[PDB]
Design an enzyme around this catalytic site. Structure first.
Site, PDB file in Angstrom:
ATOM      1  CG  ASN A   1      80.246 118.420 -17.733  1.00  0.00           C
ATOM      2  OD1 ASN A   1      79.707 119.397 -17.198  1.00  0.00           O
ATOM      3  ND2 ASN A   1      80.639 118.426 -18.997  1.00  0.00           N
TER       4      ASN A   1
ATOM      5  CG  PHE B   1      87.425 122.420 -13.406  1.00  0.00           C
ATOM      6  CD1 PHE B   1      86.270 121.714 -13.748  1.00  0.00           C
ATOM      7  CD2 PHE B   1      87.433 123.805 -13.553  1.00  0.00           C
ATOM      8  CE1 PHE B   1      85.141 122.379 -14.241  1.00  0.00           C
ATOM      9  CE2 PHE B   1      86.312 124.483 -14.044  1.00  0.00           C
ATOM     10  CZ  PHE B   1      85.163 123.766 -14.391  1.00  0.00           C
TER      11      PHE B   1
ATOM     12  NE  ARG C   1      92.231 119.251 -19.762  1.00  0.00           N
ATOM     13  CZ  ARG C   1      91.138 119.975 -19.970  1.00  0.00           C
ATOM     14  NH1 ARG C   1      90.156 119.968 -19.077  1.00  0.00           N
ATOM     15  NH2 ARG C   1      91.029 120.709 -21.067  1.00  0.00           N
TER      16      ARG C   1
END
Ligand SMILES: [Mg+2]
EC number: 5.2.1.8
Length: 164
Positions: A101, A112, A54
């Site tokens: 989380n 991230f 992502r």
């Protein structure tokens, strides 16, 4: 002393560059230790070979799901998940390394790398490190992401470990 970890990033199997992080073990030892061990692969499982599933330009690059590679998996060295150690450090800008989380006390292995200041995450995500070298590589990684995070190319951690 705060340990240093590195990721050797690759795009579709080709080397892009190295990214190193300082882990603030002095402020969040348990969280820093989890990331460090997962980077060395000393437990028999970790980040080596996983991908950044992502990537959202202008926000952050997320990875760490080495079990399902889609955001539904990953695990810590303390069990499936562990507690929010504390919220001492804030998301103060690009380079901040924080835990992803699924709500309170659900830290696993997903993390991230912020590519901007994300104050709204303060008190929600545990910050435990910051990019030391290779922030340009992190920015380069954004070119392969999208508004919803889906990547146009395979962004992987061809290799990782502890430095210094
Ligand atoms: Mg924590």
């Amino acid at each position: 002393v705060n340990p240093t970890v590195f990721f050797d990033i690759a795009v579709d199997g080709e080397p892009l560059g190295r990214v190193s992080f300082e882990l603030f073990a002095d402020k969040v030892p348990k969280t820093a230790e989890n990331f460090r061990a997962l980077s060395t692969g000393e437990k028999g499982f970790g980040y080596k070979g996983s991908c950044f599933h992502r990537i959202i330009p202008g926000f952050m690059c997320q990875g760490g799901d080495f079990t399902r590679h889609n955001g539904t998996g990953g695990k810590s060295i303390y069990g499936e998940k562990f507690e929010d150690e504390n919220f001492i450090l804030k998301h103060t800008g690009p380079g901040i390394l924080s835990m992803a989380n699924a709500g309170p006390n659900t830290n696993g292995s997903q993390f991230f790398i912020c590519t901007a200041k994300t104050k709204w995450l303060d008190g929600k995500h545990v910050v435990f490190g910051a990019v030391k070298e290779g922030m340009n590589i992190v920015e380069a990684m954004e070119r392969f992401g999208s508004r919803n995070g889906k990547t146009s190319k395979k962004i992987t951690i061809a290799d990782c470990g502890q430095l210094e």
